[PDB]
């Protein structure tokens, strides 16, 4: 699950802003390395911690995955991205799974919940924690 | 033995104690260790004295051409015997393959060389491709994805293919070589001593008309077993020139990928064809092809007669709806050589698993490893998923990444994988909003089942 370290907020982070590489087949090793198990798709955010945080900040919206929560937040516009879709499986060994990656500019919506009162960082006291979608 | 440790920080005191391992371990795979040329003569200095060095694997890391210089340095002695290297990804440019393509001139023990994510461009490739030519030089398998290659580079390759009889793997994917290029690397295939096993040019600018001298290729390299084509403009029209190929009966080619090209429910009758004809044929991905439910129809009738041995269907974002999953349910039930199930990224919905999970709970299922990654999978399919999970055997890895399920889904599967009778091993959960209710029941069931790993 979850690595222990990480707060959901930094999950989140670990997952859609922080691309360390280029190439998602380089990018996604860090990640899928944590439980030694390949994502089927990861999409990268170009953009920053702090300005997901400010698109959490914009009216919140009913989550259109689900109506029950209206924790969701619609991005001000496009925003560049890369979407890492998985082509290539390699369980034995996830170093060996190959990604396709499109680069795009969208839309997107995003949960935000409070932050982890011991844990995360008090300069932002709502924080980004699942991407609901891409448009 | 081995020293393998990939996506760690090392600090200088773990560093200081990895060394010696450096100079005892037959295998040494540091991968995105955050390594540098500050520490490049420290592996050298380990490389030169370790007594059965047989596989050096150091990608992801920034060395540069300094750094990678100082690295192969080590391997310049009479005793070294390393079979397997990889500079993926470490900042390895043109100019440094000088040095590189000199350091296999004495290697005839090497056969792997991965060079992949390195920016050599076509005057690196002309240096490498000299060394390769050397009598002394034994390589059998060259990885060179994303390494800025045009077709300028398929002669000097086809060259090495010519004077090469070891050959054995090619891989060129994510280089803009283009149908010139590619058509110029099948001829040298066809005038090759070798006996490839595997020819990998995905996102190479393969067109239709590629597709004849591939057809070629695969009809009489008989050795061939993997053929990755994957993200080219092959079209139905390219399926139908390969078919024929595919069917020679001295083909035993064993995977076939050919997600995202161009390929419709037309082309898929033909790959059928194939299918029905040729029991080597054991993994095929048509993923992200527009195959629609006609094609996901003529692939499960094919599934359900006999020949047909695929061991792995790899079919996400084919357009699929829940419509055809009454047909993949009825290939569940009877197929008895199908392990792997990629049909992710289709508009399956709750309706279409519930009719997947019926097939998939009978007696004699043997489906291993089953991806409904973002199938608009809900908390309604999860009575049906758990009742499987329990009635099916064979299963050991699910994935329902991407889908919204609730505190209601969760507990329903929690209820089934908690028991001692459910064999499943992994469960992937990635991409879903998690409430703390939700979180705090997956967390035991990690701890109360030592043998499932619940991902994400």
């Known amino acids: 699950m979850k690595p222990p370290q990480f707060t959901w907020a930094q999950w989140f982070e670990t997952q859609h802003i922080n691309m360390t590489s280029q190439q998602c087949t380089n990018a996604m090793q860090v990640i899928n390395n944590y439980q030694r198990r390949c994502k089927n798709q990861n999409t990268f955010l170009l953009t920053t911690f702090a300005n997901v945080v400010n698109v959490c900040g914009n009216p919140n919206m009913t989550c259109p995955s689900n109506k029950t929560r209206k924790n969701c937040h619609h991005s001000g516009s496009q925003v560049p991205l890369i979407h890492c879709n998985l082509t290539t499986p390699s369980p034995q060994n996830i170093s060996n799974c190959r990604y396709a990656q499109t680069p795009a500019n969208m839309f997107y919506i995003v949960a935000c919940d409070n932050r982890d009162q011991r844990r995360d960082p008090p300069q932002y006291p709502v924080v980004p924690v699942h991407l609901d979608r891409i448009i | ?456």
């Open chain 2, 1 to 456: 033995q081995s020293l393998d440790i990939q996506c760690e920080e090392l600090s200088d005191a773990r560093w200081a104690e990895l060394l010696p391992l450096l100079q005892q371990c037959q295998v040494v795979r540091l991968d995105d260790c955050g390594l540098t040329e500050a520490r490049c003569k420290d592996i050298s200095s380990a490389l030169r004295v370790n007594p059965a060095l047989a596989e050096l694997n150091l990608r992801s890391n920034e060395l540069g051409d300094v750094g990678v210089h100082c690295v192969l340095q080590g391997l310049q002695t009479p005793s070294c015997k390393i079979q397997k290297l990889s500079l993926q990804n470490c900042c390895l440019t043109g100019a440094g393959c000088g040095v590189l393509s000199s350091t296999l001139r004495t290697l005839p023990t090497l056969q792997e060389l991965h060079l992949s994510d390195n920016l050599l461009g076509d005057a690196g490739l002309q240096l490498l491709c000299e060394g390769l030519l050397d009598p002394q030089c034994r390589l059998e398998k060259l990885q060179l994805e994303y390494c800025s290659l045009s077709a300028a580079s398929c002669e000097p390759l086809a060259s090495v293919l010519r004077a090469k009889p070891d050959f054995k793997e090619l891989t060129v994917s994510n280089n803009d070589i283009n149908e010139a290029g590619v058509r110029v690397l099948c001829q040298g295939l066809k005038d090759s001593p070798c006996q490839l096993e595997a020819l990998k040019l995905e996102s190479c600018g393969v067109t239709s008309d590629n597709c004849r001298d591939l057809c070629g290729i695969v009809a009489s390299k008989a050795s061939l077993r993997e053929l990755a084509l994957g993200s080219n403009k092959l079209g139905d029209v390219g399926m139908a020139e390969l078919c024929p190929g595919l069917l020679h009966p001295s083909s035993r080619l064993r995977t076939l990928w050919i997600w995202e090209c161009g390929i419709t429910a037309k082309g898929c009758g033909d790959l059928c064809r194939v299918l029905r004809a040729k029991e080597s044929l054991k993994e095929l991905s048509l993923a992200g092809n527009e195959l629609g439910d006609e094609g996901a129809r003529l692939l499960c009738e094919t599934l359900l007669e006999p020949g047909c041995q695929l061991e792995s269907l790899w079919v996400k974002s084919c357009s699929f709806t829940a419509a055809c999953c009454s047909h993949f349910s009825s290939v569940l039930a009877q197929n008895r050589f199908l392990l792997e199930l990629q049909i992710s990224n289709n508009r399956l919905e709750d309706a279409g698993v519930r009719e997947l999970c019926q097939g998939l709970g009978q007696p004699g299922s043997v489906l291993r490893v089953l991806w409904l990654a973002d199938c608009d999978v809900s908390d309604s399919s999860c009575s049906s998923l758990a009742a499987t999970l329990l009635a099916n055997h064979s299963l050991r890895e699910l994935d329902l990444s991407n889908n919204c399920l609730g505190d209601a889904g969760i507990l329903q599967l929690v209820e089934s994988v908690r028991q001692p009778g459910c064999l499943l091993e992994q469960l992937v959960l990635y991409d879903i909003y998690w409430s703390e209710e939700m979180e705090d029941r997956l967390q035991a069931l990690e701890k109360d089942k030592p043998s499932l790993r619940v991902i994400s």
